[PDB]
Amino acid sequence: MACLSRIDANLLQYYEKPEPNNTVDLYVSGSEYSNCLLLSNSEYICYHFSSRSTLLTFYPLSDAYHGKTINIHLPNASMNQRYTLTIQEVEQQLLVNVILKDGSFLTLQLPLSFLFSSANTLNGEWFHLQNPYDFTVRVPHFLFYVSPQFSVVFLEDGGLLGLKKVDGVHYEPLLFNDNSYLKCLTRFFSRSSKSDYDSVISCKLFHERYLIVLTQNCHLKIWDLTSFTLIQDYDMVSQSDSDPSHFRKVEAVGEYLSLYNNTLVTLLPLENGLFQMGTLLVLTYTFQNNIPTNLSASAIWSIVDLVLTRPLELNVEASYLNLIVLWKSGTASKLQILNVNDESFKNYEWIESVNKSLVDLQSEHDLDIVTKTGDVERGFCNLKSRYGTQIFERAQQILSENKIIMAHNEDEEYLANLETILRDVKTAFNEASSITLYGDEIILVNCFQPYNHSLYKLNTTVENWFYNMHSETDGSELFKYLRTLNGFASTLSNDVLRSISKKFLDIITGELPDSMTTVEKFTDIFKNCLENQFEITNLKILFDELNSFDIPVVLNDLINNQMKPGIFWKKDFISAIKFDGFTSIISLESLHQLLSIHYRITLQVLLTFVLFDLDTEIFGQHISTLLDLHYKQFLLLNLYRQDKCLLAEVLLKDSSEFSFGVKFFNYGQLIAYIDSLNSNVYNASITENSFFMTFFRSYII
Ligand SMILES: [Hg+2]
Ligand SMILES: [Hg+2]
Ligand SMILES: [Hg+2]
Questions:
Q1: Which ligand has an atom closest to residue 587 CA?
Q2: Distance CA 118, CA 590 (A)
Q3: Which residues neighbour 355 within 8 Å (Cβ) at sequence distance 6 or greater?
Q4: How far is the CA of 344 from the centre of ligand 2 (A)?
Q5: By the 8 A CB rule, do 370 and 386 touch?
Q6: 464 CA from centroid of ligand 1 (Å)
Q7: Are 535 and 491 in contact (CB under 8 A)?
Q8: 15 alpha carbon to ligand 3 midpoint, in Å?
Q9: Ligand 1 center–CA 461 separation, angstroms
Q10: Neighbours of 535 (CB within 10 A)
Q11: Are 79 and 101 contacting, i.e. CB atoms less than 8 angstroms apart?
């Protein structure tokens, strides 16, 4: 069911200061919208339009901390939020146009250099206010770029203004012919009506000439800018079952369509479930099929952004095109990928993904065995480390503001609050805003709170089993084997599992004397940890299911194919010339998910060995390989939550030729690099070469 997982990235996580030191504020005489644009230098720039549409913010995706974020203040809000705003890169510059509320037409010119410089000053004219047309009468609501000098304006009443640049700073309104207003001669529409309007809600420029548009009544009017004449006028709805009942005339500009080559998909309102996709050809738009959506619980999701593109590397080869869809329902999000098999838009499959990160799911479902327990300040370090300074401090802000102050060092009552706020602030910071296709195929989501992004990563085999235990109808032997192993381990409690994990570490550390026989240690672990701690009924279920497996074969594939990665004859992981903060955290978080998953599997398998009579001699190899993998897994997970920055540092300064970071462009490269870091973790030495190293480990582990 779910083929992608969520990796949350907070670009300032590794730092104490929850804000770059280099922040410049330009004034003219972001939690409502955010997106990422690629530039000439192959760098990614992020921008956020504040809630009030009065502030625009810029910062580099790959260097959020040391890089410069630029806050561009504005005289007043734009007319209609980010819809009356545009940002394209002309020639070595970020050209920003923004029809303001008053009716002005601000023009921002930000030098590509300035964006990556150290400069806290800007020379010349980076902005030009202008009053082309009078918007006091016919108020506009949607600005649309087309070219450096030409771009249209969409009006609330339905009219399309033109806007041609003559010199390099002045714009003149080149009006298009419009007779759609004559429908007022009907007893069904009045020009003076607050309704009746059929304004554009989506628009896409095709072959630099045709301007495909979508009205609130889902009419696909196609404009030819060579004629400035309405060339087509299709009625998207008539084709599907004509429901007299109710058709939700789109009541707001949104992302209802996007086109790849000559294919075009459209989102029609039918319980919020229609994705029509025909093809343009010559100009002619021609139907193909209506693909419903698989949404339930009333179907209360709103489209956030959709992106039609070249296929991906999903679990089904039968692919032609891919539609990445981002829905939202409050601060909760949903990302899916519509995979169309053949050129006939009639055979397709809906691919879903996990919408909470593993770190989030483990916290929610009390599935975390690694994080140290105890003290109240211990729980403070845990959260602070877990959330990052930007969020932690924002939560301690909301606490005092609400008069929730820490009584004493051990005010557990307090910490209990922090938990919930942190969780909520994160959820808030994480509200979905748009999609950015990082590289060639990396699905990325940009959040409401600046410096927070979410990468949706294609799952590896093992990950898929993990994320689909309660679903895979079919699945391989190993899948079925792991599932039944989980079936039993899930019935135990955290305190029991932790006590067991600790015992496995003692075998490696020696607290469980090397003098003992394997059977003796497993005996010790059982009596001290498992006895009287589980339902004998469940052991039977486990014992039974286990007998249907060729255990040796299965464990061999798990331990020698799935878990233990492979040797590298350097399989190209673009060596980064400069520190890439984005991929850094994306890599560390990904590495942490994979090892966490490995850790649960490993523990579960080890568990069966201390419960049943498996020849400690036959499986002697496997048992010691698992105990060794478990130890490394634990340690790594332990260092991850003890100090993310330091870990990333020692972990990236471990690889020689990749001492600065990496640059991955597709999912394969990404997965490869992660699997790569995994090897560094499984091949690392864990022998303490002196009392110094032993102290270190004892003190930390
Ligand atoms: Hg799957
Ligand atoms: Hg997000
Ligand atoms: Hg770091």
A1: 3
A2: 32
A3: 6, 332, 333, 334, 335
A4: 33
A5: no
A6: 6
A7: yes
A8: 8
A9: 9
A10: 11
A11: yes
**Nearest ligand to the CA atom of 352:** 1
Structure tokens at 264: 């075009």
Q: Which residues surround ligand 2, an ion (CB under 5 A)?
A: 430, 432, 445, 447, 454
Tell me the CA–centroid distance for residue 241 and ligand 2, in Å: 36
Rounded to the nearest 10 degrees, how much is the dihedral formed by the CA atoms of 263, 264, 265, 266? -160
Please give the structure tokens belonging to residue 558: 């798990």
Q: Give whole-number Cα distances, 198 to 152, 208, 293, in Å.
A: 17, 25, 25
Q: Are 293 and 422 in contact (CB under 8 A)?
A: no
Distance in Å, CA 2 to ligand 1 centroid: 5
CA pair distance 341, 348, nearest whole angstrom: 5
- Across 353-389, b (16+ Cβ under 10 Å) vs e yields bbbbbbbbbbbeeeebbbbeeeeeeebbebbbbbbbb
Q: Closest ligand to 9 CA?
A: 2
Pair 468, 540: CB distance under 8 Å: no
Distance 285 CA to ligand 3 centre (A): 52
Instruction: Give the Å distance between the CA of 636 and the centre of ligand 2.
Output: 26
Q: What is the DSSP string of 134-161?
A: -TTTS-EEEEEE-SSSBEEEEETTS-EE
Helix/strand/coil for 546: helix
Distance from residue 484's CA to the centre of ligand 1 (Å): 18
CA 198 to ligand 2 centroid distance, Å: 32
* Alpha carbon separation from 441 to 238, 354, 462 (Å, rounded): 35, 18, 22
Q: Which ligand is nearest to the CA of 2?
A: 1
Count of other CB atoms within 10 angstroms of residue 33? 20
Q: In 10 A of CB 677, how many CB atoms?
A: 24
Taking the centre of ligand 1 as the mean of its atom positions, its distance from the CA of residue 459, in whole angstroms, is 8
Cβ count within 10 A of residue 585: 25
The secondary structure of residue 100, as a DSSP letter, is B
In units of Å, what resolution does this entry have?
Answer: 2.6
Backbone angles phi, psi at 79, to 5 degrees: -60, -60
Among all ligands shown, which has an atom nearest to the Cα of 453? 2
Looking at all shown ligands, the one closest to residue 65's CA atom is 3
Closest CA to 307 of 141, 213, 442, 454: 442
Technique employed here was X-ray
Domain residue spans of the chain: 1-354+432-459, 355-431+460-701
